[PDB]
Amino acid sequence: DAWEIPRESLRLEVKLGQGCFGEVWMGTWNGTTRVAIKTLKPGTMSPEAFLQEAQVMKKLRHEKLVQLYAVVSEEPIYIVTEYMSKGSLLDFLKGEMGKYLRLPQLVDMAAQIASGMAYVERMNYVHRDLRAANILVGENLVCKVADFGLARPIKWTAPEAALYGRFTIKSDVWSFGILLTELTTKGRVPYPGMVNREVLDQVERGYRMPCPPECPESLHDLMCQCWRKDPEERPTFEYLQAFLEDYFTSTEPQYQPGENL
Ligand SMILES: *CCC(=O)Nc1ccc(CN2C(=O)N(c3cc(OC)cc(OC)c3)Cc3cnc(Nc4ccc(N5CCN(C)CC5)cc4)nc32)cc1
């Protein structure tokens, strides 16, 4: 009941779009705090079933994870989170900001995402849908991991997860490696020109995406570590975070900006 707020304290202002979570609004809470607001169509979830799914958002707290702010847990149910001003990392990379981002910006964003996932890792959770569409961007290039597990992606999914349902933090590490290609191509679809069926067996036959143009080989090698066949050999998010945080001193101290990266 601590998270419950009055219905009149939310003002729904702008629809954000119909993605994997239906309609989500930008709005204001208590007239003072900009927030993201989501309501559920009455019927699709009982009030008891929702509060059992609201447990995840009420216990997990990290500066790189989209923060739950409040809840209206009786139908029609409302969920309130912090608001991320720039939308999804996917839209961010494809839009007008894309042309200005270079490797220093893209690596820092990746380090932030790795930091959120390192928190998920430390908590022994799994975020089975890590990809640029599920990262939200705010001011000052702040990136936060969103979790649409309540909403209930072959090209982003580790082979053992897509084929055998072996979803672990290690398959999340595989997805992060795909996410690094979205960052370095400024949001292009991975495995360009390959259909899902084509991606499945090609990857099982050992294929991996090549080094994106102007992406340093050292960053591509990091992607390849994320895409090792045996999940146990993939690096931890703790490792990924440190490698990305330290990247331009320890790993590319001679980096020079190019035309796109
Ligand atoms: C699966 C792929 C997908 O559709 N991903 C996706 C869906 C929805 C949003 C919008 N959200 C959002 O859903 N948030 C959220 C997550 C959550 O976890 C259960 C619960 C919620 O309850 C409220 C909410 C949070 C959130 C925070 N900020 C934003 N900001 C945002 C700003 C701008 C835009 N734009 C899209 C339209 N045009 C093109 C540009 C501006 C979108 C989102 N959104 C969400 C995100 C990802």
CB 228 within 8 A of CB 236: no
Report the alpha-carbon distance of residue 64 to residue 202 in Å, rounded.
Answer: 34
**Inter-residue contact 120 to 145 (CB < 8 Å):** yes
Instruction: Identify the residue whose tokens are 């702010």.
Output: 69
Cβ-count burial 173-198 (b if 16+ within 10 Å, e if not): bbbbbbbbbbbbbbbeebbeebeeee
Q: CATH number of 7-82: 3.20.20.70, 3.40.50.720, 3.30.200.20, 3.40.109.10? A: 3.30.200.20
CB 168 within 8 A of CB 232: no
If you ran DSSP here, which 8-state letter would residue 86 be given? T
Long-range (24+ apart) CB contacts under 8 A made by 91-99 are 91/187, 92/137, 92/187, 93/132, 93/182, 93/183, 93/186, 93/187, 94/186, 94/187, 98/186, 98/187, 99/186
Cβ of 256: how many Cβ atoms within 10 Å?
Answer: 6
What one-letter code names the amino acid at 49? Answer: A
135 three-state secondary structure: strand
Instruction: Indicate the angle between helix axes 169-184 and 237-245, nearest 10 degrees.
Output: 30
Residues preceding chain discontinuities in the chain with C to N over 2.5 Å: 152
Q: For the chain, which residues make up each domain, given as ranges?
A: 7-82, 87-251
Q: Which CATH class is domain 87-251?
A: mainly alpha
Give the residue, by CA position, lying nearest to ligand 1 atom 35. Answer: 87
Residue 160 CA, chain-centre distance (Å), reads 20
Residues acting as catalytic residues: 129
For tokens 């897509």, the residue is: 162
Token pair of 237 as six digits: 């998010």
Give SS3 for 29. Answer: strand
Q: Which residues line ligand 1 (CB under 6 A)?
A: 16-17, 19-21, 24, 36-38, 66, 79-81, 83-84, 87-88, 91, 133-134, 136, 146-148, 150
Is the Cβ–Cβ distance between 144 and 117 less than 8 Å? no
Q: Are 196 and 203 in contact (CB under 8 A)?
A: no
Return the H-helix or E-strand segment holding 15. strand 10-19
What is the total residue count of the chain?
261
Experimental method: X-ray
The span from the CA of 218 to the CA of 196, in Å, is 27
**23 marked as part of a ligand binding site:** yes
Structural tokens at position 140: 């000052």
**Cα gap 197→143, rounded to integer Å:** 31
DSSP three-state, residue 82: strand
- What is the CB neighbour count within 10 angstroms for residue 29? 18
Secondary structure class of 124 (helix, strand, coil): coil
> Does the annotation list 24 as a binding residue?
yes
Q: In angstroms, rounded to a whole number, what is the distance separating the alpha carbons of residues 261 and 259?
A: 6
| Measured torsion, CA atoms of residues 38, 18, 199, 163, in degrees rounded to the nearest 10 | 40
Which of 29, 45, 84 to probe ligand 1 with, by most ligand atoms within 8 A of CB?
84
